[PDB]
Tab-separated table of C-alpha atoms and ligand atoms in Angstrom:
chain	number	residue	atom	x	y	z
A	1	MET	CA	0.192	-0.099	0.126
A	2	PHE	CA	3.220	2.315	0.552
A	3	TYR	CA	6.537	0.685	0.153
A	4	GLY	CA	8.357	0.769	-2.631
A	5	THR	CA	11.629	-1.167	-3.637
A	6	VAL	CA	15.133	-1.066	-1.887
A	7	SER	CA	18.290	0.281	-3.668
A	8	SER	CA	21.567	1.822	-2.925
A	9	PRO	CA	21.810	5.205	-4.242
A	10	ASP	CA	25.274	6.081	-3.332
A	11	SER	CA	28.319	4.168	-1.616
A	12	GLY	CA	27.125	3.109	2.228
A	13	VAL	CA	23.240	4.468	1.652
A	14	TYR	CA	20.313	2.165	1.315
A	15	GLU	CA	17.198	4.196	0.412
A	16	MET	CA	13.305	3.131	-0.233
A	17	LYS	CA	10.301	5.268	-0.768
A	18	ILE	CA	7.257	5.459	1.747
A	19	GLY	CA	4.384	6.937	0.343
A	20	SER	CA	5.822	10.179	-1.301
A	21	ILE	CA	8.889	10.192	1.365
A	22	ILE	CA	12.315	8.697	0.520
A	23	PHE	CA	13.625	6.852	3.725
A	24	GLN	CA	17.065	6.544	3.792
A	25	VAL	CA	19.808	5.024	6.240
A	26	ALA	CA	23.592	4.740	6.909
A	27	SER	CA	26.135	4.687	9.402
A	28	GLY	CA	28.501	7.516	10.336
A	29	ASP	CA	28.877	10.614	12.594
A	30	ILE	CA	25.288	12.500	12.566
A	31	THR	CA	26.769	15.805	13.758
A	32	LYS	CA	28.316	15.719	9.939
A	33	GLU	CA	25.169	15.749	8.624
A	34	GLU	CA	22.891	19.102	6.768
A	35	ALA	CA	19.298	18.803	7.103
A	36	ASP	CA	16.357	21.368	8.415
A	37	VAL	CA	16.000	19.292	11.570
A	38	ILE	CA	18.698	17.053	13.124
A	39	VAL	CA	17.294	14.871	16.302
A	40	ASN	CA	19.129	14.152	19.878
A	41	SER	CA	18.270	11.117	21.723
A	42	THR	CA	18.699	12.488	25.186
A	43	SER	CA	17.852	11.915	28.706
A	44	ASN	CA	14.548	13.134	30.461
A	45	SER	CA	16.400	16.811	31.845
A	46	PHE	CA	17.944	17.313	28.230
A	47	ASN	CA	21.103	17.554	29.806
A	48	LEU	CA	23.310	14.249	28.995
A	49	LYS	CA	26.532	13.902	27.265
A	50	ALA	CA	27.053	10.519	26.072
A	51	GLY	CA	27.319	8.711	22.744
A	52	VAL	CA	24.994	10.674	20.326
A	53	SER	CA	24.017	13.147	23.038
A	54	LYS	CA	27.808	13.908	23.772
A	55	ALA	CA	28.881	14.883	19.962
A	56	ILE	CA	25.783	16.530	19.448
A	57	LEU	CA	25.886	18.840	22.613
A	58	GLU	CA	29.525	19.281	21.789
A	59	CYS	CA	29.170	20.427	18.423
A	60	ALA	CA	26.055	22.212	18.880
A	61	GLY	CA	27.747	24.324	21.513
A	62	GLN	CA	27.105	26.263	24.880
A	63	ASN	CA	24.191	28.604	23.732
A	64	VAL	CA	22.171	25.250	22.527
A	65	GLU	CA	23.041	23.628	26.109
A	66	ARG	CA	21.615	26.781	28.152
A	67	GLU	CA	18.855	26.890	25.897
A	68	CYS	CA	18.203	23.260	26.449
A	69	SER	CA	18.134	23.430	30.573
A	70	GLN	CA	15.986	26.676	30.409
A	71	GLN	CA	13.558	24.714	28.866
A	72	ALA	CA	13.672	21.836	31.202
A	73	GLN	CA	13.180	24.098	34.641
A	74	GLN	CA	10.325	25.976	32.978
A	75	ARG	CA	8.021	23.009	32.416
A	76	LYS	CA	7.259	19.241	31.841
A	77	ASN	CA	8.540	18.686	28.567
A	78	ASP	CA	8.469	15.125	26.479
A	79	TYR	CA	10.815	16.796	24.257
A	80	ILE	CA	12.182	20.387	23.461
A	81	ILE	CA	13.153	22.380	20.233
A	82	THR	CA	16.366	24.626	20.165
A	83	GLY	CA	18.743	26.371	17.346
A	84	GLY	CA	20.992	24.532	15.318
A	85	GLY	CA	23.735	26.108	17.094
A	86	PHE	CA	27.301	25.297	15.140
A	87	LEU	CA	25.639	22.344	13.340
A	88	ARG	CA	24.195	22.268	9.718
A	89	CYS	CA	20.500	22.520	10.594
A	90	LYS	CA	17.885	25.163	11.299
A	91	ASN	CA	16.652	23.163	14.336
A	92	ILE	CA	17.649	20.327	16.821
A	93	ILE	CA	14.735	18.845	18.492
A	94	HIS	CA	15.809	16.750	21.365
A	95	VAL	CA	13.783	13.508	22.208
A	96	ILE	CA	13.999	11.156	25.477
A	97	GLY	CA	15.968	8.039	24.389
A	98	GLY	CA	13.880	6.059	27.073
A	99	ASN	CA	10.576	7.249	25.815
A	100	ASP	CA	8.308	5.390	23.021
A	101	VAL	CA	10.208	5.815	19.939
A	102	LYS	CA	6.959	5.638	17.682
A	103	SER	CA	5.445	8.588	19.702
A	104	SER	CA	8.738	10.636	19.403
A	105	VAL	CA	9.537	10.284	15.624
A	106	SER	CA	5.355	11.044	15.139
A	107	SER	CA	6.369	14.575	16.877
A	108	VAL	CA	9.183	15.054	14.963
A	109	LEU	CA	7.447	14.593	11.514
A	110	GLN	CA	4.534	16.790	12.940
A	111	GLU	CA	6.938	19.716	14.369
A	112	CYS	CA	8.555	19.643	10.961
A	113	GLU	CA	5.297	20.180	8.868
A	114	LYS	CA	4.634	22.965	10.951
A	115	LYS	CA	7.912	24.997	10.178
A	116	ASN	CA	7.251	23.689	6.310
A	117	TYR	CA	10.279	21.734	6.644
A	118	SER	CA	11.702	19.294	3.890
A	119	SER	CA	14.433	17.208	5.449
A	120	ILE	CA	15.282	15.386	8.881
A	121	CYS	CA	17.996	13.392	9.886
A	122	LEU	CA	17.886	11.365	13.209
A	123	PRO	CA	19.924	8.493	15.027
A	124	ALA	CA	18.871	5.108	16.221
A	125	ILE	CA	16.896	6.513	18.991
A	126	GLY	CA	16.765	4.611	22.165
A	127	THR	CA	19.800	2.432	21.402
A	128	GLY	CA	22.357	4.452	23.222
A	129	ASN	CA	22.363	5.431	27.240
A	130	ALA	CA	18.570	4.024	27.313
A	131	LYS	CA	19.106	0.490	26.000
A	132	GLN	CA	16.129	-0.089	23.844
A	133	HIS	CA	16.760	-3.020	21.426
A	134	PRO	CA	17.842	-2.168	17.852
A	135	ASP	CA	15.115	-4.400	16.131
A	136	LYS	CA	12.239	-2.683	17.893
A	137	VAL	CA	13.629	0.690	17.292
A	138	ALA	CA	13.932	0.208	13.531
A	139	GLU	CA	10.075	-1.259	13.312
A	140	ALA	CA	9.043	1.921	15.439
A	141	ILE	CA	10.897	4.484	13.332
A	142	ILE	CA	9.529	3.059	10.152
A	143	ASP	CA	5.801	2.303	11.756
A	144	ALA	CA	5.716	6.027	12.465
A	145	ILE	CA	6.569	6.973	9.102
A	146	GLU	CA	3.950	4.878	7.676
A	147	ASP	CA	1.088	6.291	9.830
A	148	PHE	CA	2.111	9.690	9.362
A	149	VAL	CA	1.791	9.138	5.454
A	150	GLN	CA	-1.494	7.007	5.712
A	151	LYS	CA	-3.063	10.018	7.184
A	152	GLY	CA	-2.405	11.962	4.480
A	153	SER	CA	-0.177	14.154	6.704
A	154	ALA	CA	3.159	14.315	4.425
A	155	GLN	CA	2.914	17.378	2.765
A	156	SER	CA	6.404	19.564	3.128
A	157	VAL	CA	8.576	16.762	4.261
A	158	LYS	CA	10.657	14.626	1.847
A	159	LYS	CA	13.210	12.875	3.091
A	160	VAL	CA	13.947	10.963	6.273
A	161	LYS	CA	17.300	9.711	6.870
A	162	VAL	CA	18.696	7.513	9.868
A	163	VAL	CA	22.525	7.972	10.365
A	164	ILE	CA	23.619	5.154	12.659
A	165	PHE	CA	26.779	5.309	14.924
A	166	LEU	CA	27.464	1.682	14.676
A	167	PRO	CA	27.546	-0.693	11.503
A	168	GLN	CA	25.718	-3.579	13.244
A	169	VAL	CA	22.706	-1.649	14.328
A	170	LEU	CA	22.319	-0.457	10.183
A	171	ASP	CA	22.399	-4.275	9.459
A	172	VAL	CA	19.196	-4.577	11.669
A	173	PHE	CA	17.542	-1.510	9.724
A	174	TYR	CA	18.343	-2.714	6.447
A	175	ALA	CA	16.706	-6.139	7.045
A	176	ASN	CA	13.701	-4.092	8.310
A	177	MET	CA	13.325	-2.395	5.064
A	178	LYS	CA	13.660	-5.504	2.959
A	179	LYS	CA	10.689	-7.096	5.054
A	180	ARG	CA	8.400	-4.376	4.086
A	181	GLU	CA	9.868	-3.434	0.199
A	182	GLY	CA	6.918	-3.721	-2.312
B	201	LIG	C1	35.882	9.746	18.724
B	201	LIG	C2	35.811	7.966	19.215
B	201	LIG	C3	34.097	8.221	18.907
B	201	LIG	N1	33.458	7.261	20.000
B	201	LIG	N2	33.760	6.714	20.945
B	201	LIG	N3	32.370	5.866	21.520
B	201	LIG	N4	31.335	6.728	21.657
B	201	LIG	C4	32.008	7.369	20.314
B	201	LIG	N5	30.906	8.449	19.702
B	201	LIG	C5	29.671	8.578	19.600
B	201	LIG	O1	28.939	7.785	20.218
B	201	LIG	C6	29.286	9.556	18.921
B	201	LIG	C7	27.960	9.657	18.174
B	201	LIG	C8	27.855	10.754	16.822
B	201	LIG	C9	29.511	11.086	17.264
B	201	LIG	O2	29.983	10.336	17.902
B	202	LIG	CL1	19.650	6.575	23.911
B	203	LIG	CL1	22.920	5.511	16.735
């Protein structure tokens, strides 16, 4: 009803269509990517500096760190939106690694439509300090995108890319894409 064919457009990149959205996966350092939004996977205090979160806050810089702690003390947040700092993006959306991954990705997609953004880059949310299982994380990320497309909500969003720190986790995402393909 939605899934296209899995192929490799560039060395180390694997893609398929989900409705009108191009979904891609690759291994690498997410802080070297350019996109309208980059997603951080962090703690419920939005101040963690371990794994992906360490790289994102160090690269983004101290003003982004300060924006995070200011919003954390203002109210109870499921996620927060900051500037991009010295990352190559318009905004960072910081999600909680321990939360339901399908819910977190659905929120990211909705916030990107609100800003008329076209591109998103995310890590394998939850697979760091939160120690969620990679197979369940891949299923949840792709399920969120399918639901967004099924509801007719994809208008501005055209490209969603997962950049994954460990090659072994990339293999789990690729297998899930092959399970779903048309
Ligand atoms: C310099 C050695 C790399 N390294 N070693 N242990 N953890 C990391 N890094 C990350 O988890 C990470 C995510 C994105 C960029 O870095
Ligand atoms: Cl995590
Ligand atoms: Cl990752």
